[PDB]
Amino acid sequence: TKKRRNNGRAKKGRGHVQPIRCTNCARCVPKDKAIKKFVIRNIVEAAAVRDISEASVFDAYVLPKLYVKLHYCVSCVIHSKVVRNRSREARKDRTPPPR
Amino acid sequence: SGALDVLQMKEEDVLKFLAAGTHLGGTNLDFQMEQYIYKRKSDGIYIINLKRTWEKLLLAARAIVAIENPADVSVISSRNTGQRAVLKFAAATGATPIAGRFTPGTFTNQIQAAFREPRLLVVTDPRADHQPLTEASYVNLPTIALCNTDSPLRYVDIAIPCNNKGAHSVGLMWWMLAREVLRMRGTISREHPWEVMPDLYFYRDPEEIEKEE
Amino acid sequence: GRVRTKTVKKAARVIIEKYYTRLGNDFHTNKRVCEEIAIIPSKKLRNKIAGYVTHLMKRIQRGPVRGISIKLQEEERERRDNYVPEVSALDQEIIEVDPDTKEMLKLLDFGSLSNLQVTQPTVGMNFKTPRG
Amino acid sequence: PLAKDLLHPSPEEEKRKHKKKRLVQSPNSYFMDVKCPGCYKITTVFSHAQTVVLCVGCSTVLCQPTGGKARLTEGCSFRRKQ
Amino acid sequence: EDVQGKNCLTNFHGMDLTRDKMCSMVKKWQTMIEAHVDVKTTDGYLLRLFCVGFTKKRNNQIRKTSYAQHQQVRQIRKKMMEIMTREV
Amino acid sequence: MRAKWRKKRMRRLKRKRRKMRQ
RNA sequence: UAAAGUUGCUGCAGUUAAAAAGCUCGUAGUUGGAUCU
RNA sequence: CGCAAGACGGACCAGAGCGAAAGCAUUUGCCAAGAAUGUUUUCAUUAAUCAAGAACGAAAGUCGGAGGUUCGAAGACGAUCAGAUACCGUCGUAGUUCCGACCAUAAACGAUGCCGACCGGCGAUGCGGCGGCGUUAUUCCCAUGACCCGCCGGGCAGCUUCCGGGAAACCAAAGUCUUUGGGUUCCGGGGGGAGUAUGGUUGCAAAGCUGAAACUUAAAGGAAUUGACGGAAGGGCACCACC
């Protein structure tokens, strides 16, 4: 029985999608099927922000951020709890989490 | 109306409609409400043709008058915008009102305290009063609705094209329906204005009632 | 926990709706009147009912609560339902009307009206929310 | 709808449709007479002309082919017939 | 280049943008156009300039994505290369 | 048994059989 | 033999129960738009 | 700081585009091709599907010649295990890359032949065309490019479905089916034996295509429903649990 209408991937109107490697296990997962997270995180953690700011040579330095694109296989994305299993009805909800 | 000069819409009615904003619909248009709108403004709002609105209001008044027992007409409003208007309509006309939550099974569950079997059913908004509309398809119950441009017309037999969003427009629409029903019945004449003003049907939110007093 | 069950809650609601006259704000007076006007077969349950009656009296002294339909607040609400302004809010001397609705009224055989002021249509067709 | 009349459609509703999907098909194109300052004769030009039209009375191009309607140069007056 | 008087004398050797800046300008609903030329100056220095540009969404755009078509991207890249060559 | 492995075993059987038959 | 519409011309089925060729050209075969009193 | 090798083409990159499918992503140039759109151009049934034949056909694999970074079947070690010569780790050979010649197979999938009609609604999106307020860019006279609001045509998709259909899951097609006939190709007939044996045929080989029977069996199987279980998740609880 068909679990998903899109077969768990985002491929329409094409035959082949180039694979990528899961950031955790290095599994070969198609780019459309893979679960992608774009993490924009401060290089300095919030606990260390004040201590780094005081030791700054320049006043008003605004610390840089980290830009890392994360690719996940289904197994590692489920294990890491980035995605969870949902009900048959809530599976269809494509809206990203409001956070 | 029947093209009668007696049933034609007067200037006072158009003044009330324009003041209440009844002619102003929404940015969306249901494909079954296309015959009731006139044009779409530069800001996307659809203008509701007041000729068609008056025609459908008079048709609904005829349908209500044809129900011999006034209590067999049921008026429904789940939204607070039309609630007080529904109670005023029921008081003036004699219909049975349901203001607020419509209990499912009201029309279908005979073993139930609040079980009623109306002969006609009038709602303020088909999208907001979808439960009584759905239950009206179980008991052979014809339905009249106040429908905006985006209102769905399933189970709606007489859709009155009007802005059912604004409180002024909803109150005016219910007030005019009551006035036309009374005029068609015989009580109160159409040669002089009705003694009840439309603002008796308007919804007043807590901020408004606190400010006014 | 101190969650009141349906028994004491419903008994308090009925007692307040039916004898709102006699009940006050004091636990002792509420206890005495509750003992008088109801057959409560236990004293612990009577005390619980009286305590919830006092709590709900405080609740309703600060506004209307949905479970109780006392006659005074219903009379006040119904009086508020009959309020009618001195002049109708639809009795505007001037009604602002867009050119398209004016053309509709012209097709409606109502073009001679002088209450209507034609407003400038908005030259921006930006009425939809951006997608994303 | 459930009762839309197909024998007598509105003229706007027929200009809206595809030229082939109309009740009787009719082109969306036309012929124009284009006057040039450098000449006097009659130069009938197809609205969707695929050729570069040249006025015989000057070195001025009349229209340029385009994916749809031809692009008439600025300074030429065109009158549509039929 | 040389040291005299215990002072080290430097010259231009290259230019770059910080990694955070470049990663910040790469967003998801736009086209990024890149070009590069190998162009010599008048004093014998041969440079390889890299230019990057991103498609901008108009202030009243309702469309989610702003993508330049392939010919538009080629024209933009040609203009980039021409301007860099003219300026170097 | 997994069908792929059943096919592999059958293919090895056929390889031995064609080895013995000349 | 009927039941077997489980051989289906009448009259089966081919997404998941058995099943549409990996795909596209292609000859034979089959089928083929309006229009004549 | 440089130098050299091969490999790859991140982010941009999308339920977006192109191609018959396999498949296709750095710039630029050349070469030939292509769909859609526009057309008051031309020919005038030239068409649809297709035995026989034919072109292409992932990966792996084979034979030559280059190349051989990385990864890596085989293999060699090191590892908690009762027992790996499995999973994990360090290496590592053929391969992985390119050029010829083979191979013709994939869950080669939308597990849904193709061509043609009809049957709801809505918002988008890609391409072409058409129309229209206004906002932005190249000297102040215009197109045009980027937006904005629409219409038409083809396309990749997002849809209730009590139109309708299905065993249902679900499908605007998997609808227009006992109210059963638009055209046409391939193809199935309970489960195993078995895609096996044999014959033929192709291939260097690996293998590919076509392809039984004796015998054996009352079920195998599909969808869904409740429970039970999960070294599955979320939220709670208990000193017959722990801390």
From Swiss-Prot, chain C:
The gene is RPS17. The modification Phosphothreonine is found at T129. This is Small ribosomal subunit protein eS17. The modification Phosphoserine is found at S112. The keyword Ribonucleoprotein applies. There is a cross-link at K102 (Glycyl lysine isopeptide (Lys-Gly) (interchain with G-Cter in SUMO2)). The lineage of its organism: Eukaryota, Metazoa, Chordata, Craniata, Vertebrata. One of its GO terms (cellular component) is nucleolus. The keyword Phosphoprotein applies. It is found in: Cytoplasm; Nucleus, Nucleolus.
UniProtKB/Swiss-Prot annotation, chain D:
Residues 1-22 are annotated as: Disordered. Keywords: Cytoplasm, Diamond-Blackfan anemia, Metal-binding, Nucleus, Phosphoprotein, Ribonucleoprotein, Ribosomal protein, Zinc, Zinc-finger. It holds the Pfam family Ribosomal_S27e. Zn(2+) binds at C36, C39, C55, C58. Its cofactor is Zn(2+). It is found in: Cytoplasm; Nucleus, Nucleolus. The keyword Transmembrane helix does not apply. Residues 1-15 have a biased composition (Basic and acidic residues). Binds 1 zinc ion per subunit. Expressed in a wide variety of actively proliferating cells and tumor tissues. GO terms for cellular component: cytosol; cytosolic ribosome; cytosolic small ribosomal subunit; GABA-ergic synapse; glutamatergic synapse; nucleolus; nucleoplasm; nucleus. Component of the small ribosomal subunit. The ribosome is a large ribonucleoprotein complex responsible for the synthesis of proteins in the cell. Required for proper rRNA processing and maturation of 18S rRNAs. Part of the small subunit (SSU) processome, first precursor of the small eukaryotic ribosomal subunit. Belongs to the eukaryotic ribosomal protein eS27 family. This is Small ribosomal subunit protein eS27. The lineage of its organism: Eukaryota, Metazoa, Chordata, Craniata, Vertebrata. The gene is RPS27.
From Swiss-Prot, chain E:
One of its GO terms (biological process) is cytoplasmic translation. Component of the small ribosomal subunit. Mature ribosomes consist of a small (40S) and a large (60S) subunit. The 40S subunit contains about 33 different proteins and 1 molecule of RNA (18S). The 60S subunit contains about 49 different proteins and 3 molecules of RNA (28S, 5.8S and 5S). Identified in a IGF2BP1-dependent mRNP granule complex containing untranslated mRNAs. Binds with high affinity to IPO4. Interacts with DDIT3. Part of the small subunit (SSU) processome, composed of more than 70 proteins and the RNA chaperone small nucleolar RNA (snoRNA) U3. Its main location: cytoplasm. Signal peptide: none annotated. This is Small ribosomal subunit protein eS1. Keywords: Acetylation, ADP-ribosylation, Cytoplasm, Differentiation, Isopeptide bond, Nucleus, Phosphoprotein, Ribonucleoprotein, Ribosomal protein, Ubl conjugation. The modification ADP-ribosyltyrosine is found at Y67. GO terms for molecular function: mRNA 5'-UTR binding; RNA binding; structural constituent of ribosome. One of its GO terms (cellular component) is extracellular exosome. Disulfide bonds: none annotated. Belongs to the eukaryotic ribosomal protein eS1 family. The keyword rRNA processing does not apply. ADP-ribosylated at Tyr-67 by PARP1 in presence of HPF1. It is found in: Cytoplasm; Nucleus; Nucleus, Nucleolus.
From Swiss-Prot, chain F:
Belongs to the eukaryotic ribosomal protein eS32 family. Residues 1-22 are annotated as: Disordered. InterPro entries: Ribosomal_eS32. It comes from the Eukaryota. Coiled coil: none annotated. Keywords: Cytoplasm, Ribonucleoprotein, Ribosomal protein. This is Small ribosomal subunit protein eS32. Component of the small ribosomal subunit. Initially thought to be part of the large ribosomal subunit. Crystal structures show eS32/eL41 to be a small ribosomal subunit forming a bridge at the interface of the 2 subunits. GO terms for molecular function: mRNA 3'-UTR binding; mRNA 5'-UTR binding; RNA binding; structural constituent of ribosome. GO terms for cellular component: cytoplasm; cytosol; cytosolic large ribosomal subunit; endoplasmic reticulum. It is found in: Cytoplasm. Component of the small ribosomal subunit. The ribosome is a large ribonucleoprotein complex responsible for the synthesis of proteins in the cell. Interacts with the beta subunit of protein kinase CKII and stimulates phosphorylation of DNA topoisomerase II alpha by CKII. GO terms for biological process: cytoplasmic translation; translation. It comes from Homo sapiens.
